[PDB]
């Protein structure tokens, strides 16, 4: 066939009911998941590609880079409460990985800082139960499929897309076969 199980994408033995419809995850410390964003811009693709009435969902991992994977975790939380993912994703993956400012919490809240949330915002956030609540959903999710790896794509709870079976040649033809398998798992 033309989409083959494991060959562009994988399926879970051990399928996950209740699951958001497109579930992404990663790491501001994940090397691919940085290229995902900088450079190839694959959730927004998928996004353009995606049917009339599908929620997209996107979550941090903690299992990279110990105490601060953590404490990125939380701030993830902080962004999708207070809805900035779009004005600190950026300034995270480049402090992260590019310039190495980010050390410490306070340098995460640096960068909420700069981008214009309000420090008696971001704290009261940080330490609100809406977002321990959120924390907890972004760990039950990975927990759900047995997360070892980002980035991380699943589908209706069921399939897992499986990057290494698309070519790599040319950049834009790897995010369109993203997206297109992506769209191809949703209307399965």
């Known amino acids: ?5 494991g060959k562009q994408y994988t399926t879970l033995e051990k399928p996950v009911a209740g699951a958001p419809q497109v579930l992404e995850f990663f790491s501001f410390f994940c090397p691919h998941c940085y290229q995902f964003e900088e450079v190839l811009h694959i959730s927004d693709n998928v996004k353009k590609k995606l049917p009339e ?4 969902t996107k979550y941090h991992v903690n299992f990279m880079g110990g105490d601060l994977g953590k404490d990125l975790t939380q701030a993830w939380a902080v962004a999708m409460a207070l809805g900035v993912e779009d004005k600190v994703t950026v300034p995270l993956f480049e402090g992260v990985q590019k310039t190495q400012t980010i050390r410490s919490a306070s340098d995460i809240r640096d960068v909420f800082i700069n981008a214009g949330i309000k420090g008696e915002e971001y704290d009261a956030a940080w330490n609100s139960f809406v977002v321990k609540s959120l924390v907890a959903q972004q760990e039950k999710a990975a927990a759900d499929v047995q997360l070892r790896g980002v980035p991380a794509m699943f589908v209706n709870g069921k399939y897992q897309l499986n990057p290494q079976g698309m070519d790599t040649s040319n950049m834009d033809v790897f995010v369109q076969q993203y997206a297109d398998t992506v769209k191809y798992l949703s209307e399965k």
Not at 1 to 5: K, L, T, V
Not at 53 to 56: D, I, S, Y
Request: charged share 35%; aromatic share 12%; glycine share 12%.
């Open 1 to 5: 066939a033309q989409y083959e199980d």
């Open 53 to 56: 009435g599908v929620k997209m």
